[PDB]
Enzyme design. Structure first.
Site, PDB file in Angstrom:
ATOM      1  N   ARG A  45      43.259  41.816  40.560  1.00  0.00           N
ATOM      2  CA  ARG A  45      43.052  42.053  41.998  1.00  0.00           C
ATOM      3  C   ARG A  45      43.339  43.498  42.404  1.00  0.00           C
ATOM      4  O   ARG A  45      42.669  44.058  43.294  1.00  0.00           O
ATOM      5  CB  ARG A  45      43.897  41.071  42.852  1.00  0.00           C
ATOM      6  CG  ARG A  45      43.302  40.921  44.216  1.00  0.00           C
ATOM      7  CD  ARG A  45      44.183  40.298  45.272  1.00  0.00           C
ATOM      8  NE  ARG A  45      43.397  39.912  46.428  1.00  0.00           N
ATOM      9  CZ  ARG A  45      43.856  39.855  47.682  1.00  0.00           C
ATOM     10  NH1 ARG A  45      45.096  40.189  47.980  1.00  0.00           N
ATOM     11  NH2 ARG A  45      42.990  39.456  48.627  1.00  0.00           N
ATOM     12  N   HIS A  49      40.782  45.802  44.480  1.00  0.00           N
ATOM     13  CA  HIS A  49      41.064  46.344  45.786  1.00  0.00           C
ATOM     14  C   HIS A  49      41.105  47.878  45.786  1.00  0.00           C
ATOM     15  O   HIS A  49      40.777  48.498  46.811  1.00  0.00           O
ATOM     16  CB  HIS A  49      42.367  45.754  46.294  1.00  0.00           C
ATOM     17  CG  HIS A  49      42.138  44.472  47.036  1.00  0.00           C
ATOM     18  ND1 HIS A  49      42.968  44.016  48.021  1.00  0.00           N
ATOM     19  CD2 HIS A  49      41.152  43.573  46.954  1.00  0.00           C
ATOM     20  CE1 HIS A  49      42.533  42.866  48.508  1.00  0.00           C
ATOM     21  NE2 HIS A  49      41.399  42.573  47.881  1.00  0.00           N
ATOM     22  N   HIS A 172      38.123  34.465  40.976  1.00  0.00           N
ATOM     23  CA  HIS A 172      38.987  33.534  41.698  1.00  0.00           C
ATOM     24  C   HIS A 172      39.347  32.302  40.866  1.00  0.00           C
ATOM     25  O   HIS A 172      40.070  31.446  41.371  1.00  0.00           O
ATOM     26  CB  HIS A 172      38.384  33.128  43.055  1.00  0.00           C
ATOM     27  CG  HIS A 172      38.619  34.175  44.105  1.00  0.00           C
ATOM     28  ND1 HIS A 172      38.105  34.061  45.398  1.00  0.00           N
ATOM     29  CD2 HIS A 172      39.345  35.332  44.088  1.00  0.00           C
ATOM     30  CE1 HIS A 172      38.516  35.135  46.100  1.00  0.00           C
ATOM     31  NE2 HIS A 172      39.263  35.919  45.330  1.00  0.00           N
ATOM     32  N   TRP A 188      43.060  27.981  42.598  1.00  0.00           N
ATOM     33  CA  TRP A 188      41.681  27.518  42.606  1.00  0.00           C
ATOM     34  C   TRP A 188      41.366  26.556  41.474  1.00  0.00           C
ATOM     35  O   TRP A 188      40.292  25.901  41.469  1.00  0.00           O
ATOM     36  CB  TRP A 188      40.783  28.716  42.520  1.00  0.00           C
ATOM     37  CG  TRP A 188      40.660  29.631  43.660  1.00  0.00           C
ATOM     38  CD1 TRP A 188      39.775  29.536  44.710  1.00  0.00           C
ATOM     39  CD2 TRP A 188      41.411  30.823  43.892  1.00  0.00           C
ATOM     40  NE1 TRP A 188      39.946  30.579  45.572  1.00  0.00           N
ATOM     41  CE2 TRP A 188      40.936  31.385  45.098  1.00  0.00           C
ATOM     42  CE3 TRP A 188      42.443  31.458  43.190  1.00  0.00           C
ATOM     43  CZ2 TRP A 188      41.470  32.552  45.611  1.00  0.00           C
ATOM     44  CZ3 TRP A 188      42.960  32.645  43.714  1.00  0.00           C
ATOM     45  CH2 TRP A 188      42.485  33.205  44.909  1.00  0.00           C
TER      46      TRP A 188
END
Ligand code: HEM
EC number: 1.11.1.5
Length: 291
Positions: A45, A49, A172, A188
């Protein structure tokens, strides 16, 4: 503004494989983090980002300048929790102070995907740190409470098409949502520190219920204890996205190959590679090295 890749002076593939390896060894050692999920997901992540602030219209943001190290960007509400990935990388940077910040944040993501038994991700060096005033403002990363039209329009700014978006969203599978961090809670799926196509399978095969979480936000929940964000669920509400979700749910190798391309592209938006730059590197995993 043009950002030309500039190889860290005198460095070559072996130098970067040593950085890879140090990241990978710390990933293995520091296994307790996040209730034994480990740092793999937050490092993926972080790479995303730090890259996903890019704007194709004016070449602002992106991975090149490593601007997450400045307070405006590390304190973006959208980045809550990524400080854990930054702190993980600190001792790596201290050992290898010659690597640029952008190169280290992006390499952390590559290393995490591969060590989690994901596809190989070719990676190029040459990001150069840029000054504090080049840090992009907050608000360029996506909201989770939106629909497919939002997602599609959002990702046009990153020059991603429908297939690239659906592929990238397969990340995800990893890690989880944390209520105090994003206002969403739950994993998830079951394999959340091994890179697989589980995200697509769960979207299609679980029985999802639209519920409110304890932060009063809606999310989709299953009896297995899994969740999907509204933007995740939008991938099966939109018929164009749905077709692609089904493709990846039914072909692990295709998902791997398309993810690899899209993730490299994400990590490379905004960077101009000279004609005589090195070819992209493909790092060996620890396992492949016998380490
Ligand atoms: C519409 C686009 C997207 C939205 C709205 C979105 C939103 C979110 C949110 C709300 C979280 C939970 C943060 C938390 O509470 O810790 C999260 C986690 C995560 N996202 Fe995204 N995401 C998107 C796209 C992506 C992409 C493109 C990737 C990378 C290829 C990615 C990788 C991750 C990972 C690996 C996690 C788990 C982090 C952890 O366990 O610490 N996401 N995302």
């Amino acid at each position: 503004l043009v950002h030309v890749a500039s190889v860290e002076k005198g460095r070559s593939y072996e130098d970067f494989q040593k950085v890879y390896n140090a990241i990978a060894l710390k990933l293995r050692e520091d296994d307790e983090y996040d209730n034994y999920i480990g740092y793999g997901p937050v490092l993926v992540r972080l790479a995303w980002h730090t890259s996903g602030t890019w704007d194709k219209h004016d070449n602002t943001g992106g991975s090149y300048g490593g601007t997450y190290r400045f307070k405006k960007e590390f304190n973006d509400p959208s980045n809550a929790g990524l400080q854990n990935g930054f702190k993980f990388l600190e001792p790596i940077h201290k050992e290898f102070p010659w690597i640029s910040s952008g190169d280290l944040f992006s390499l952390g993501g590559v290393t995490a995907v591969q060590e989690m038994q994901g596809p190989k991700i070719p990676w190029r060096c040459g990001r150069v740190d840029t000054p504090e005033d080049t840090t992009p403002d907050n608000g360029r990363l996506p909201d989770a409470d939106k629909d497919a039209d939002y997602v599609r329009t959002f990702f046009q700014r990153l020059n991603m098409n429908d297939r690239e978006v659906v592929a990238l969203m397969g990340a995800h599978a990893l890690g989880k949502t944390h209520l105090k961090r994003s206002g969403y809670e739950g994993p998830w799926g079951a394999a959340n520190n091994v890179f697989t196509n589980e995200f697509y399978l769960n979207l299609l095969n679980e029985d999802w219920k639209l519920e409110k979480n304890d932060a009063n936000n809606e999310q989709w929940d299953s009896k297995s204890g899994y969740m999907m964000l509204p933007t995740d669920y939008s991938l099966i509400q939109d018929p164009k996205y749905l077709s692609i979700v089904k493709e990846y749910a039914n072909d692990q190798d295709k998902f791997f190959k398309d993810f690899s391309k899209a993730f490299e592209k994400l990590l490379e938006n905004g960077i101009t590679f000279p004609k005589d730059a090195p070819s992209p590197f493909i790092f060996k995993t620890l396992e492949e090295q016998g380490l």
